PDB file of C-alpha atoms in Angstrom:
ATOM      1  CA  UNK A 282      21.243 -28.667  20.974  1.00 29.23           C
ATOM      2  CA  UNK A 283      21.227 -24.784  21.129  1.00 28.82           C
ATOM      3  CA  UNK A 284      23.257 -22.542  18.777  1.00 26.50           C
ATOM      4  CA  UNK A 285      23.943 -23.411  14.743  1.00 24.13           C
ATOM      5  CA  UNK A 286      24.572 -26.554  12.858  1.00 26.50           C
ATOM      6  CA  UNK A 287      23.714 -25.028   8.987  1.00 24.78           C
ATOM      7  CA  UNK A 288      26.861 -24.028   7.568  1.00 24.69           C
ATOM      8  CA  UNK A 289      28.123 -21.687   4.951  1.00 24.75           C
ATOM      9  CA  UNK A 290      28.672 -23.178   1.826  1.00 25.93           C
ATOM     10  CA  UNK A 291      31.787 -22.182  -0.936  1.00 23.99           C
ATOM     11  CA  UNK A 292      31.496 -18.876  -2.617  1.00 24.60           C
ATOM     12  CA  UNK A 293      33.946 -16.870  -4.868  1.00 21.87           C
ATOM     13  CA  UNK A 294      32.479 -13.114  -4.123  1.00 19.77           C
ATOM     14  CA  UNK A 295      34.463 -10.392  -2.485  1.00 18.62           C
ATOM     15  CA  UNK A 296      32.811  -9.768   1.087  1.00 20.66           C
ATOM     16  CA  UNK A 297      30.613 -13.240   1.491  1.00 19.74           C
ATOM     17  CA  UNK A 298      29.502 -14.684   4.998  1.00 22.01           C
ATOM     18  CA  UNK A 299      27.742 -12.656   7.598  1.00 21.35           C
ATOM     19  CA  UNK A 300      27.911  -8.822   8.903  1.00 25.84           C
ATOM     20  CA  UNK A 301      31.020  -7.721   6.119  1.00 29.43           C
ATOM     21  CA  UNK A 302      31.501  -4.089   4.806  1.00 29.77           C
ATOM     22  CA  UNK A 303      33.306  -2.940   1.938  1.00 31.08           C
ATOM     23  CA  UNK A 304      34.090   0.347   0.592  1.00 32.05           C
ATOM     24  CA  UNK A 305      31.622   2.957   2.790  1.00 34.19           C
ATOM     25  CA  UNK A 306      32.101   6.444   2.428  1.00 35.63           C
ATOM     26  CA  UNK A 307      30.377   9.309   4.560  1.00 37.02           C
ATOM     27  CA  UNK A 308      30.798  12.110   2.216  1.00 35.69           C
ATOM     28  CA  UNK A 309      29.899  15.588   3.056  1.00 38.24           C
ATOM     29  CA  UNK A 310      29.667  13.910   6.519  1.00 35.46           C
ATOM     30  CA  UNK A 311      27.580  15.017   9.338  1.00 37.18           C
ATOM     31  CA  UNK A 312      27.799  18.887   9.940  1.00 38.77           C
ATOM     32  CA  UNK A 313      25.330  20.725  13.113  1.00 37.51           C
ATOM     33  CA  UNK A 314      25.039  24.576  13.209  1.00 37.85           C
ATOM     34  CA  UNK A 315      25.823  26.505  16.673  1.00 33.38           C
ATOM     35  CA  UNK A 316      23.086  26.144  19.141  1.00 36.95           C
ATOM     36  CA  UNK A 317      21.119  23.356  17.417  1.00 34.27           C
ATOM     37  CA  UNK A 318      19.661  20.688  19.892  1.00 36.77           C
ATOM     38  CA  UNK A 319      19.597  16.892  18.885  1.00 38.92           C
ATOM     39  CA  UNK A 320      19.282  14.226  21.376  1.00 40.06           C
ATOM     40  CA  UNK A 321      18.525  10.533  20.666  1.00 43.06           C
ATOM     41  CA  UNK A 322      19.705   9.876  16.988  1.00 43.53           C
ATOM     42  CA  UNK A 323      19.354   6.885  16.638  1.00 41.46           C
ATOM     43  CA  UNK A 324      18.824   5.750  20.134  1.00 42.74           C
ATOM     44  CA  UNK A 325      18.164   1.788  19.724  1.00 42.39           C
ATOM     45  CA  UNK A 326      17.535   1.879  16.055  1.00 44.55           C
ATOM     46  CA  UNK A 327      18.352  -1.489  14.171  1.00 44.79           C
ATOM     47  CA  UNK A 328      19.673  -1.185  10.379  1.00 43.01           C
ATOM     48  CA  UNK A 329      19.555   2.434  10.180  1.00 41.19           C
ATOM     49  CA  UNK A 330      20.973   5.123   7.991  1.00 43.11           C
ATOM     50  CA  UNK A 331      22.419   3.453   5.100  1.00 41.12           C
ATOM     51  CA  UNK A 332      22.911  -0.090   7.557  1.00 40.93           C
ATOM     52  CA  UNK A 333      22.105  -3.976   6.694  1.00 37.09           C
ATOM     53  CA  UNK A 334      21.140  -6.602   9.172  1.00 37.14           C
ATOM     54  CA  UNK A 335      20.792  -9.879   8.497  1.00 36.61           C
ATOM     55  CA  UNK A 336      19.337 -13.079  10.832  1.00 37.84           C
ATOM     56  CA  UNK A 337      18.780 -17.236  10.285  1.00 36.24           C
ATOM     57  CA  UNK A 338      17.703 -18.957  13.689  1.00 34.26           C
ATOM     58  CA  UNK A 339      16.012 -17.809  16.265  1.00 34.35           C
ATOM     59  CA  UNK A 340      15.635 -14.465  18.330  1.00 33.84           C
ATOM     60  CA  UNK A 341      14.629 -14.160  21.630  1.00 36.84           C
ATOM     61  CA  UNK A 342      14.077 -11.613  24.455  1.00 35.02           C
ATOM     62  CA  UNK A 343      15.715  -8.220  22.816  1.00 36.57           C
ATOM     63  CA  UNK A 344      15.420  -4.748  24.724  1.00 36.18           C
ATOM     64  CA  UNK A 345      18.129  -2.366  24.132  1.00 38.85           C
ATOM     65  CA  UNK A 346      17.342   0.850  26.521  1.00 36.93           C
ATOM     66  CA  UNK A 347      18.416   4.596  26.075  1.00 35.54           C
ATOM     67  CA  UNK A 348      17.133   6.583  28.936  1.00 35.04           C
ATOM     68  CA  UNK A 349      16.179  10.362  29.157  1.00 32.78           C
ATOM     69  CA  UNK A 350      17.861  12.858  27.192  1.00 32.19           C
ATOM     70  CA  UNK A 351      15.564  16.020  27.001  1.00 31.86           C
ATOM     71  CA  UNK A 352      15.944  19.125  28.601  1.00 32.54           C
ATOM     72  CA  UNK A 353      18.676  21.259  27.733  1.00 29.85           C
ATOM     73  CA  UNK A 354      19.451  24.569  27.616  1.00 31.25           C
ATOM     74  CA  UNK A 355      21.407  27.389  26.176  1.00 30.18           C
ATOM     75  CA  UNK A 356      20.397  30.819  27.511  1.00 30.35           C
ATOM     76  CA  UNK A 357      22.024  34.469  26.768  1.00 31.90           C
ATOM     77  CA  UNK A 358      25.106  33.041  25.494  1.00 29.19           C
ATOM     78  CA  UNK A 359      26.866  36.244  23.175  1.00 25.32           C
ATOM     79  CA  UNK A 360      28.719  35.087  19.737  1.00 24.88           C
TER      80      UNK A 360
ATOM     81  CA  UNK B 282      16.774 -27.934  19.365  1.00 23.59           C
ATOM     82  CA  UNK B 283      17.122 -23.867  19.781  1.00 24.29           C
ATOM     83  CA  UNK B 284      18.446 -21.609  17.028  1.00 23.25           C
ATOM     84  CA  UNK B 285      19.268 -22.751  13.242  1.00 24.50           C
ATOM     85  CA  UNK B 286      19.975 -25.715  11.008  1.00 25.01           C
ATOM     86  CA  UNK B 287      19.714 -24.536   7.701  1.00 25.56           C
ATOM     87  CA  UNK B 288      22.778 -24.090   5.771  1.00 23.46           C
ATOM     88  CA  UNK B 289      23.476 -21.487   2.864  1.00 24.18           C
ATOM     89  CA  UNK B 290      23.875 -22.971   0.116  1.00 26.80           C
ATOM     90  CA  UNK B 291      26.990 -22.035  -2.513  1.00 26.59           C
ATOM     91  CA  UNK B 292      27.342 -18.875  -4.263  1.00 28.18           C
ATOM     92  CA  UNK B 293      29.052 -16.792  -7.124  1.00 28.93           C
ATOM     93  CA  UNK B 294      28.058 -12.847  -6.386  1.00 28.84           C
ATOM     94  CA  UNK B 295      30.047 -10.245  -4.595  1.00 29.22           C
ATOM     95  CA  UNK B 296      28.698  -9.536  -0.888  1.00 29.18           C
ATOM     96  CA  UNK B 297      25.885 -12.445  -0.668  1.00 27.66           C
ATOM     97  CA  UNK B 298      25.017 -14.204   2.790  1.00 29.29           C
ATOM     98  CA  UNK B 299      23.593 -12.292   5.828  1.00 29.99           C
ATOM     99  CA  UNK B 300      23.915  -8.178   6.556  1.00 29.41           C
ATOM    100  CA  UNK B 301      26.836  -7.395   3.802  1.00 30.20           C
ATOM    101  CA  UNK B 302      27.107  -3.722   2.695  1.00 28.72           C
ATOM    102  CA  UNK B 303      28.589  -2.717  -0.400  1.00 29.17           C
ATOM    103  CA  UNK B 304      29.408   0.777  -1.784  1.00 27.33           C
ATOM    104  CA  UNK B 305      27.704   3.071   0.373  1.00 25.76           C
ATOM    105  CA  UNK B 306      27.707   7.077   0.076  1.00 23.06           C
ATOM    106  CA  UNK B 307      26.265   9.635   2.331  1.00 23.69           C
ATOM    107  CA  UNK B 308      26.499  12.529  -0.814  1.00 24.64           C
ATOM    108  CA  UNK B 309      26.164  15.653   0.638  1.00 24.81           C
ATOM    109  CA  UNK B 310      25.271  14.214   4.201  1.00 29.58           C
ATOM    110  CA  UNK B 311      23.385  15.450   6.882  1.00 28.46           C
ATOM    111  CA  UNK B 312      23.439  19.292   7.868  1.00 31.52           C
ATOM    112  CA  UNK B 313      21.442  20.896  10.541  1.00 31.24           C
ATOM    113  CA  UNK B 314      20.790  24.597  10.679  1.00 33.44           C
ATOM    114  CA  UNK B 315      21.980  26.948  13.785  1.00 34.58           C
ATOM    115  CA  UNK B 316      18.938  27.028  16.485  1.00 34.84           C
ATOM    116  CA  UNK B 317      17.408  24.094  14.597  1.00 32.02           C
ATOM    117  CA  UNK B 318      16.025  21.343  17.342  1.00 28.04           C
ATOM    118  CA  UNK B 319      15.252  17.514  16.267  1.00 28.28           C
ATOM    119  CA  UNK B 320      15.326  15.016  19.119  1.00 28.75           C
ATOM    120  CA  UNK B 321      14.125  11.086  18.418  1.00 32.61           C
ATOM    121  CA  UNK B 322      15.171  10.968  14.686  1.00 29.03           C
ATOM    122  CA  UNK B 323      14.836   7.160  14.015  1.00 29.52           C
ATOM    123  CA  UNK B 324      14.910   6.242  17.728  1.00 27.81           C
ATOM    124  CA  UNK B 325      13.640   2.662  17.912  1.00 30.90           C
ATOM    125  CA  UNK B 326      13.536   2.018  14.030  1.00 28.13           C
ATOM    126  CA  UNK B 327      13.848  -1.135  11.876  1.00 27.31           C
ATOM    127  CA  UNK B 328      15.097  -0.714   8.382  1.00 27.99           C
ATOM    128  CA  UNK B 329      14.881   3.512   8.061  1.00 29.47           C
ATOM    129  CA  UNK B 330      16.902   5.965   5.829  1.00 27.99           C
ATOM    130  CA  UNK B 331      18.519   3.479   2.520  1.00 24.92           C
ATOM    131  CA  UNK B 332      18.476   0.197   5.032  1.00 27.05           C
ATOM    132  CA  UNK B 333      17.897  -3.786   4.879  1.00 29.93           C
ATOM    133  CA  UNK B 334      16.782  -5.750   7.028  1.00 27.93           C
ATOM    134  CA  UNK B 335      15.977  -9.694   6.083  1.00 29.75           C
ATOM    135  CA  UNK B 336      15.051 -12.971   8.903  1.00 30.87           C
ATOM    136  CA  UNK B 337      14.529 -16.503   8.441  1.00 30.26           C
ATOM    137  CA  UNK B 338      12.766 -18.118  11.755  1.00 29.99           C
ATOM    138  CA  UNK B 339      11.913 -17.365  15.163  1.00 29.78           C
ATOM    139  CA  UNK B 340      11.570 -12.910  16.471  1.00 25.96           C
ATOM    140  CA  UNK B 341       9.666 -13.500  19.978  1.00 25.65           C
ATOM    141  CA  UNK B 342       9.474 -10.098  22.226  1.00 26.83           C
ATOM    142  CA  UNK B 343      11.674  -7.087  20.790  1.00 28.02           C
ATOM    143  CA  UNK B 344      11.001  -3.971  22.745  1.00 29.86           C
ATOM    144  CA  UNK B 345      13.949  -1.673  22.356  1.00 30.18           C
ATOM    145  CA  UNK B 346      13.022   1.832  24.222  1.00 29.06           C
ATOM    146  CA  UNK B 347      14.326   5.297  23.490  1.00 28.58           C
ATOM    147  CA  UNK B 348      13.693   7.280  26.911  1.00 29.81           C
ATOM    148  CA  UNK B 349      12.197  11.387  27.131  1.00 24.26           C
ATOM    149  CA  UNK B 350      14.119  13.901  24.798  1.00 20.59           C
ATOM    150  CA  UNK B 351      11.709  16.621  24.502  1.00 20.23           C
ATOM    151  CA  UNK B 352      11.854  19.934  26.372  1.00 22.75           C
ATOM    152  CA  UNK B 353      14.900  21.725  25.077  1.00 22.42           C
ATOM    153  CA  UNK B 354      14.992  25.763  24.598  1.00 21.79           C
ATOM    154  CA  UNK B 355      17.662  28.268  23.206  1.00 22.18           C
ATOM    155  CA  UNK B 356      16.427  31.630  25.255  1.00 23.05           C
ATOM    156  CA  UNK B 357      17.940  35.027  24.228  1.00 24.06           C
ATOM    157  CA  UNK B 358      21.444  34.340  22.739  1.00 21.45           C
ATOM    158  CA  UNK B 359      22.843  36.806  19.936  1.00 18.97           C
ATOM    159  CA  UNK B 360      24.860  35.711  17.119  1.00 18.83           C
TER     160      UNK B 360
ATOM    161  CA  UNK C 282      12.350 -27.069  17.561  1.00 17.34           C
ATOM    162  CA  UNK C 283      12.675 -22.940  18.077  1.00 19.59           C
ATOM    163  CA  UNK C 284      14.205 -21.662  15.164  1.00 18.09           C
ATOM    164  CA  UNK C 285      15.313 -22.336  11.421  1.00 18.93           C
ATOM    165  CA  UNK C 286      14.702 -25.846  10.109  1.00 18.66           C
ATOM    166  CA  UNK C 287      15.033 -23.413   6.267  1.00 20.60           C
ATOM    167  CA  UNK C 288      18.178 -23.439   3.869  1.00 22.04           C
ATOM    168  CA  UNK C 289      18.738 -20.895   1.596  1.00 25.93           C
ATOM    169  CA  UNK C 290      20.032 -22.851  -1.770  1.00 25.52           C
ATOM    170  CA  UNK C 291      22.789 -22.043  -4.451  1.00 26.39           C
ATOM    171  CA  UNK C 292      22.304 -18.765  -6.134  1.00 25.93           C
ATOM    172  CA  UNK C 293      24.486 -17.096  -8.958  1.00 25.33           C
ATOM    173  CA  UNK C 294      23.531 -13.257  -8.240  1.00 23.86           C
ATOM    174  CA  UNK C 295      25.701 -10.253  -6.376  1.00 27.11           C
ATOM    175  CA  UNK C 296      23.860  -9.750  -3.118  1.00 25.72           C
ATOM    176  CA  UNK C 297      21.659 -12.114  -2.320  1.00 28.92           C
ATOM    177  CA  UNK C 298      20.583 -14.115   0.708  1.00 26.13           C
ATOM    178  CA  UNK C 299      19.161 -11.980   3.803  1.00 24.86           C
ATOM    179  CA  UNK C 300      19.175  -8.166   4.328  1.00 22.53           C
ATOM    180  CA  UNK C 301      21.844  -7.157   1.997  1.00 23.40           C
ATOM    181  CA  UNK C 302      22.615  -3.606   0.393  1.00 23.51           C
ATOM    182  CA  UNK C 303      24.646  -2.328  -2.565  1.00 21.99           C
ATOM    183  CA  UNK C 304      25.129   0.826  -4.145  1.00 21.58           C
ATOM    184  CA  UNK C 305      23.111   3.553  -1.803  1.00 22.98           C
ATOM    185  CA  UNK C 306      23.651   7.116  -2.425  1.00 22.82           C
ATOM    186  CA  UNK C 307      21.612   9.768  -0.194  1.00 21.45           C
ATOM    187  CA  UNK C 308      22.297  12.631  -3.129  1.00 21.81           C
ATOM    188  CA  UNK C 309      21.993  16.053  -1.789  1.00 16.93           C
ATOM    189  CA  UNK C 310      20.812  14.290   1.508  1.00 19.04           C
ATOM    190  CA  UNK C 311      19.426  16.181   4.750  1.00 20.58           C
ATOM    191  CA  UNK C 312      18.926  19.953   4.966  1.00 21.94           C
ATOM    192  CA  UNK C 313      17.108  21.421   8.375  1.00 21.83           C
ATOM    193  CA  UNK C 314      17.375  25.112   8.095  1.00 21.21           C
ATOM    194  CA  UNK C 315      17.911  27.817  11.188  1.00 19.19           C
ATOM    195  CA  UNK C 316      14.767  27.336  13.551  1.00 19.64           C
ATOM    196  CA  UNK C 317      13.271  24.651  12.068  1.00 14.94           C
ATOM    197  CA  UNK C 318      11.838  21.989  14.958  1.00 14.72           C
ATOM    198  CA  UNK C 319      11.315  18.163  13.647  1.00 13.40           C
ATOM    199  CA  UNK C 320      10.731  15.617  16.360  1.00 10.58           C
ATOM    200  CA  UNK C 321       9.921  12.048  16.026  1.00 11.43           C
ATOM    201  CA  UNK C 322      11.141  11.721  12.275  1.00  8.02           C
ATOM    202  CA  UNK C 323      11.029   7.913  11.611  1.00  5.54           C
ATOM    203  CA  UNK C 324      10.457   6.909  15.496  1.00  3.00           C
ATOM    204  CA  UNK C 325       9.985   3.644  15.644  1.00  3.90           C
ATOM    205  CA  UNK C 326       8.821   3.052  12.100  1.00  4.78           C
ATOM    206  CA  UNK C 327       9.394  -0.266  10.145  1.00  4.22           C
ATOM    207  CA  UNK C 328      11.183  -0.027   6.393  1.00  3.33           C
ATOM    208  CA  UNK C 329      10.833   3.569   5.426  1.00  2.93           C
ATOM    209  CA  UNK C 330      12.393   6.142   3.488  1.00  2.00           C
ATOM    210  CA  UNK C 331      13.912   3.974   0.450  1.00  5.08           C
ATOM    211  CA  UNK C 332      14.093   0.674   2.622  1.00  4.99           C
ATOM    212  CA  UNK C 333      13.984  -3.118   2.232  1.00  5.98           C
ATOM    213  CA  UNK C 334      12.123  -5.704   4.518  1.00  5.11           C
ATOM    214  CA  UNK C 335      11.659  -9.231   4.672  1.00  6.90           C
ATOM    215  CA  UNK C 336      10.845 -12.225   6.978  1.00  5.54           C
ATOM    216  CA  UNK C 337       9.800 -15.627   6.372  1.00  5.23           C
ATOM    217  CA  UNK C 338       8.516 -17.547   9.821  1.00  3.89           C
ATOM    218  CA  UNK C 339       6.835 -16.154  12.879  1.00  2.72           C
ATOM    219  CA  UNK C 340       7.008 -12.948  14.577  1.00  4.80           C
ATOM    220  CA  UNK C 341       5.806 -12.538  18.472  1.00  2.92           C
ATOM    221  CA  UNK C 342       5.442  -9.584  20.119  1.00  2.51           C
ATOM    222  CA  UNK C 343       7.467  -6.449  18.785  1.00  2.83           C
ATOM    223  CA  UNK C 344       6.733  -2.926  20.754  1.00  2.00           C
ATOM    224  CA  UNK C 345       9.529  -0.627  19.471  1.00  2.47           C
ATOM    225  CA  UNK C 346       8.891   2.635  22.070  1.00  2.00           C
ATOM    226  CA  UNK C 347      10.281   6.141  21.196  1.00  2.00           C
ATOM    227  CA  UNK C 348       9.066   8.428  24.322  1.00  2.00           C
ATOM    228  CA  UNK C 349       8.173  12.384  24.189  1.00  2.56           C
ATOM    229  CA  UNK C 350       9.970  14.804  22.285  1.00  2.00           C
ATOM    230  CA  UNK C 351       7.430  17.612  21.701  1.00  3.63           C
ATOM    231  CA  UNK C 352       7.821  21.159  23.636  1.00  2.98           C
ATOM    232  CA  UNK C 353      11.487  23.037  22.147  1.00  5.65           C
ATOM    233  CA  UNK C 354      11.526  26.728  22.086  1.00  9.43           C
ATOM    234  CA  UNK C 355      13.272  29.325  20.202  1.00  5.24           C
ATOM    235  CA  UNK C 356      13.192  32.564  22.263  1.00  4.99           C
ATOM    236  CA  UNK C 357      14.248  35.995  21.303  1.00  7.51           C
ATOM    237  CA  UNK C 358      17.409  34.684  19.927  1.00  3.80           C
ATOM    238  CA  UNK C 359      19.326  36.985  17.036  1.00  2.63           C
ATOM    239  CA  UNK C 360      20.974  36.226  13.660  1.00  8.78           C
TER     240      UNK C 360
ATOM    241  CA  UNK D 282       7.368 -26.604  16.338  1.00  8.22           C
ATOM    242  CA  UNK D 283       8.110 -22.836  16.336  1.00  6.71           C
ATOM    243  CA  UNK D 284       9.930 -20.271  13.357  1.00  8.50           C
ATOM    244  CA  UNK D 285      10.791 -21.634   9.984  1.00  9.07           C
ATOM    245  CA  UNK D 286      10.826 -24.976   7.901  1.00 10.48           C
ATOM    246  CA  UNK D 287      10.449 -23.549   4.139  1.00  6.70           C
ATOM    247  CA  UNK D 288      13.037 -22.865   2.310  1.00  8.88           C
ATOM    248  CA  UNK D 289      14.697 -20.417  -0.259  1.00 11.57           C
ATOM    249  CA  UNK D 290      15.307 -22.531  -3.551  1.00 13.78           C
ATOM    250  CA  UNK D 291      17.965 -22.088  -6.244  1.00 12.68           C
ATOM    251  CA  UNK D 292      18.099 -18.608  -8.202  1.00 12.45           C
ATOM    252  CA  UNK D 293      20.274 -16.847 -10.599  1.00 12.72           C
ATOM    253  CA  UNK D 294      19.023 -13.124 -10.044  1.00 10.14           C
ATOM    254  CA  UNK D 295      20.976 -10.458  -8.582  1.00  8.70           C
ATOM    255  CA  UNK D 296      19.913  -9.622  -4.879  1.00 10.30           C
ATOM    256  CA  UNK D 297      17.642 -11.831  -4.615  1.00  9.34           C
ATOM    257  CA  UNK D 298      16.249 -13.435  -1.387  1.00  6.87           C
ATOM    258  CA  UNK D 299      14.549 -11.515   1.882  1.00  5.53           C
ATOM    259  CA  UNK D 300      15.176  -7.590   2.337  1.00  5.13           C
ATOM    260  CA  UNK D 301      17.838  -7.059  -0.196  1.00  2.00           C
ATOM    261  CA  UNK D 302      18.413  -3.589  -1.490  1.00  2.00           C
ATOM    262  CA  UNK D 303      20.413  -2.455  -4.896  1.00  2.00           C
ATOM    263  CA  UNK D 304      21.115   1.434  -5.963  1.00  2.00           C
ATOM    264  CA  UNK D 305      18.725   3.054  -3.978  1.00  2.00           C
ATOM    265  CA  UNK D 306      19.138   7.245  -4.756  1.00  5.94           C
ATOM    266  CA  UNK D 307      17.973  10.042  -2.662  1.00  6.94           C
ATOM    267  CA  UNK D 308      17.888  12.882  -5.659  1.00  7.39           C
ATOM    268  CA  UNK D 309      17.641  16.289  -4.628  1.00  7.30           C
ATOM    269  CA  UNK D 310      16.884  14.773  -1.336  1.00 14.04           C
ATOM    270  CA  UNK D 311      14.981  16.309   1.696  1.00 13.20           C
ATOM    271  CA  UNK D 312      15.019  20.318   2.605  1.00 13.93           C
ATOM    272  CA  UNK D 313      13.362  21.709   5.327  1.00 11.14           C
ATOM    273  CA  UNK D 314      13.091  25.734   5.368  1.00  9.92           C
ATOM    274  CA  UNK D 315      13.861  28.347   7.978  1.00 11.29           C
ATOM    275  CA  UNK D 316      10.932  28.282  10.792  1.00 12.25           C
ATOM    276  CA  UNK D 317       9.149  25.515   9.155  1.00 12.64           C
ATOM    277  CA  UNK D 318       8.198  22.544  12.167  1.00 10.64           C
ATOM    278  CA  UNK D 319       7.110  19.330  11.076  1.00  9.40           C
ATOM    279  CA  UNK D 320       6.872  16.787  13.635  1.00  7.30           C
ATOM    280  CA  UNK D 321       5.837  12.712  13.094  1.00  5.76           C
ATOM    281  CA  UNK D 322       6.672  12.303   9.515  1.00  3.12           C
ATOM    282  CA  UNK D 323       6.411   8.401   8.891  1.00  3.69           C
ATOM    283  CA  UNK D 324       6.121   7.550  12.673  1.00  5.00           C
ATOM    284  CA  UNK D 325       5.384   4.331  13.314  1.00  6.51           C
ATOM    285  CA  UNK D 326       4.640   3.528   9.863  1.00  9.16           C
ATOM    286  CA  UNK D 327       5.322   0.374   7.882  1.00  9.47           C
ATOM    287  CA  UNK D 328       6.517   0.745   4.341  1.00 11.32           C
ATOM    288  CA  UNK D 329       6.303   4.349   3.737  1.00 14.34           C
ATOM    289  CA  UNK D 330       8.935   6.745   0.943  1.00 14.33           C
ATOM    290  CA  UNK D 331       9.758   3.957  -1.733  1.00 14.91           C
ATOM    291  CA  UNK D 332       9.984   0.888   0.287  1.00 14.29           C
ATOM    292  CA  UNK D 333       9.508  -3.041   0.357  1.00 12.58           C
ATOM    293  CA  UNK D 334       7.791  -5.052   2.783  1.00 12.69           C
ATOM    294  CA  UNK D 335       6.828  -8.682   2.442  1.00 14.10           C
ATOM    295  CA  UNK D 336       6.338 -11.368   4.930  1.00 14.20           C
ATOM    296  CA  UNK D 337       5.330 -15.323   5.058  1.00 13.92           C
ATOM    297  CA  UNK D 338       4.475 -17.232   8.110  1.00 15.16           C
ATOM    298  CA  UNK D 339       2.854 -15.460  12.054  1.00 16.73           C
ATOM    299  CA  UNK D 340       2.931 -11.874  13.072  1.00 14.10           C
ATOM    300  CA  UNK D 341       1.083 -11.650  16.367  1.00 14.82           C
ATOM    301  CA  UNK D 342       0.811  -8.819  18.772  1.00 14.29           C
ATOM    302  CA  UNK D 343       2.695  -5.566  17.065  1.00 16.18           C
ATOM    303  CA  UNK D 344       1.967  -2.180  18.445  1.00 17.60           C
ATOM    304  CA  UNK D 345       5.033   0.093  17.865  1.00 18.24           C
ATOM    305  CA  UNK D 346       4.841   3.436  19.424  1.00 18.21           C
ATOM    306  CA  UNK D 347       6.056   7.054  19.056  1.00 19.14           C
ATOM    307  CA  UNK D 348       4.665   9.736  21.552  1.00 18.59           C
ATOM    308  CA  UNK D 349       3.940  13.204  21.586  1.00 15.58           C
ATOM    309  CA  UNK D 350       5.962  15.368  19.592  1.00 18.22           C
ATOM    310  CA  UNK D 351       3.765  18.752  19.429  1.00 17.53           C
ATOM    311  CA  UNK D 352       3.784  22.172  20.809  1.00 20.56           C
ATOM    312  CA  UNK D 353       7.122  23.731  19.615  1.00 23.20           C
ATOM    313  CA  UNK D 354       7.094  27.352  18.882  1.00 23.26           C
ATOM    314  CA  UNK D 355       9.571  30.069  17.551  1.00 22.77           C
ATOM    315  CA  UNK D 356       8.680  33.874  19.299  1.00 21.52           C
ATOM    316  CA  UNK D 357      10.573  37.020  18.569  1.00 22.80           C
ATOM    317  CA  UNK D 358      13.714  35.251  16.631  1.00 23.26           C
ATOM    318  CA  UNK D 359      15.593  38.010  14.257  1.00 22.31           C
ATOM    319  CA  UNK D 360      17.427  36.741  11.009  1.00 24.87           C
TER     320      UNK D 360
END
C-alpha cells in the first residue's frame, strides 16, 4: 500500500513523536539598519537557522520555487 | 509498497523521534548595518546556521530554486 | 518496495532518533556593519556552520539552485 | 527494491542516531566590518564551520549550485 504502517512505540520524554518544539527563544531578535537591502533569506532553505527536520519513508519529486527578487532601489531619500 | 514500514522503537529521553527542537536561543541575534546589502543568505540550504537534518530511505529529485536577487543600489541619500 | 523497510530500536538517551537538536545558542551571533555587501552566504550549501547531517539509504538526484545576487552599489550616500 | 532495509539497533547514548545535534555555541560569533564585501562564504559546500556529515547506502547525481555573486562596489560614501 502507499503511506506508513511502522508505528511509534511508548516513550516517557517531554516533546516525543515527530516535528515538536519546546521552549525557543529569539533573543536579541532580528534587527536591519535604515536603507539596508536583503532579499531571499532563506528562500527554500530546509532546516535552517537554528531548525530540525526529520524523515523515515520515502521522498519523492520536491521543488519549492521563490522567483526574482533583485532590483531595488532607494535614491536621494533625506533623513 | 510506497513510503515506510519501520516502526520506532520505545524510548526514555526528552524530545527523541523525528525533527524535535529543544531549548533554542538566538543570543544577541542577527543585526544588519544601515546601507549594508546581503541578498541569497542560505537560499536553497540543507542543514545551515546550528541545524539537523537526519533520513532513513528513499530522497529521489529535490530541486528547490531561489530565483535572481542581485542588482540592488542605495544612490545619494543623506542621513 | 520504495521506501523504509528500517526500524529504529529502543534507546534510553534525550534526543535521539533522526535530525534532532537541543541546547543551540548563536552567542553574540550576526554583525554586518554599514556598507558591508555579502551575497550568497550559505547558498545552497549542505550542513554548515555548526550543523548535523545524516542519511542511511539512497539519494537520487538533488540540484539545490540559488540564482545571481552579485552587482549592489553604494553611491555617494552620507552618514 | 529501492531506499532502506538496515536498521538502527538498541542504544543507551544521548542523541544518538542520524543528524542529531546537542549544545552547539556560536562564541563571539561572526562580525563583519564597515566596507568590508565578502561574497560565497561556504557556497555550495558540504560540511564546512564545525559540522557532521555521514552517509550509508547511494548518492547519485548531486550538483548543487550558487551563481554569481561578484562585482559590488562602495564609491564616494561619507561616515
Amino acid at each position: 500500500g502507499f503511506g506508513n504502517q511502522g508505528g511509534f512505540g511508548n516513550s516517557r520524554g517531554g516533546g516525543a513523536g515527530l516535528g515538536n518544539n519546546q521552549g525557543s527563544n529569539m533573543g536579541g531578535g532580528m534587527n536591519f539598519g535604515a536603507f539596508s537591502i536583503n532579499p531571499a533569506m532563506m528562500a527554500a532553505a530546509q532546516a535552517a537557522l537554528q531548525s530540525s527536520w526529520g524523515m523515515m519513508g520515502m521522498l519523492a519529486s520536491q521543488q519549492n520555487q521563490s522567483g526574482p527578487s533583485g532590483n531595488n532601489q532607494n535614491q536621494g531619500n533625506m533623513q
